[PDB]
Amino acid sequence: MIYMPIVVAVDKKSDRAERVLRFAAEEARLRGVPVYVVHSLPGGGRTKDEDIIEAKETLSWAVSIIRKEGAEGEEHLLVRGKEPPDDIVDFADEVDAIAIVIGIRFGSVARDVILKANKPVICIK
Amino acid sequence: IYMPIVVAVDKKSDRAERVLRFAAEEARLRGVPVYVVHSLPGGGRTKDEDIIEAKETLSWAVSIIRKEGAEGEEHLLVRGKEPPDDIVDFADEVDAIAIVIGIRKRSPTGKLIFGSVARDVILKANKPVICIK
Numbered sequence A: 001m002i003y004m005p006i007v008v009a010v011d012k013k014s015d016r017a018e019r020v021l022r023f024a025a026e027e028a029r030l031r032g033v034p035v036y037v038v039h040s041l042p043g044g045g046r047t048k049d050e051d052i053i054e055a056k057e058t059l060s061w062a063v064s065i066i067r068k069e070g071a072e073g074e075e076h077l078l079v080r081g082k083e084p085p086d087d088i089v090d091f092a093d094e095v096d097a098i099a100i101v102i103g104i105r106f107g108s109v110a111r112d113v114i115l116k117a118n119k120p121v122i123c124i125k
Numbered sequence B: 001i002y003m004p005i006v007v008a009v010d011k012k013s014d015r016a017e018r019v020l021r022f023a024a025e026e027a028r029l030r031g032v033p034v035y036v037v038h039s040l041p042g043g044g045r046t047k048d049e050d051i052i053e054a055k056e057t058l059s060w061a062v063s064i065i066r067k068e069g070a071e072g073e074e075h076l077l078v079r080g081k082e083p084p085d086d087i088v089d090f091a092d093e094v095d096a097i098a099i100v101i102g103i104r105k106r107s108p109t110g111k112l113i114f115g116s117v118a119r120d121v122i123l124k125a126n127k128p129v130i131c132i133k
Ligand SMILES: Nc1ncnc2c1ncn2[C@H]1C[C@H](O)[C@@H](COP(=O)(O)O)O1
Pocket: A009, A010, A011, A012, A020, A038, A039, A040, A041, A084, A101, A102, A103, A104, A105, A106, A107, A108, A109, A110, A111
């Protein structure tokens, strides 16, 4: 009932995101836990409704990948007055993640997640 | 053929142990071995002292891996190469599922800082890199 999920941070649909998702799904599957797929937006006046729609499509796509890979997945759109890396890091701590999976190209978001996470961070090319 | 977990270690510490423990669990879960690697420049830069210390760390590290219910292998790399490149090339050579590495390193004042070898490994690796604090 109480598991430690794999947290995967997704920005957009891409081949890199798929690779990140498939690695995450294999971890989750091996450990018997779900994957939590996260996308962060600033909210407040900074977030349009158009932004929420695209994020939701990306997340819906991401979770379909996880599931197709034989893992349980859940979508979490974070709209919290935060920037992505703090959101990802705070989220991972809030759900007691086993690890955070992110794509790298570092990239600004990735470097702050690497440096600030209190969890293992798994970097996928 | 298996794809091993590769884990890089420098010195014996409670931190290196956290890295080994995570690497060992990855390996357990996947039914693969852990390859413990340590890199040394060789030639004029490496003293016998460094070899002996390297070998003692590797042995200690394999033991931690084994204690955690995984198989370990010691791989001391002495190739005239800089450590990030050694680690990255080795992981490609062995077709690792992932590299596990400690991203913090002690500065000369005793304070842990973001390691530059670890940083370079994360940036250069072709394999997934699992970053442990
Ligand atoms: N806004 C937002 N929400 C969720 N996940 C994100 C966001 N921006 C980037 N990312 C993820 C996408 C990659 O997996 C990783 C690298 O971002 P990089 O910018 O290349 O460092 O961070």
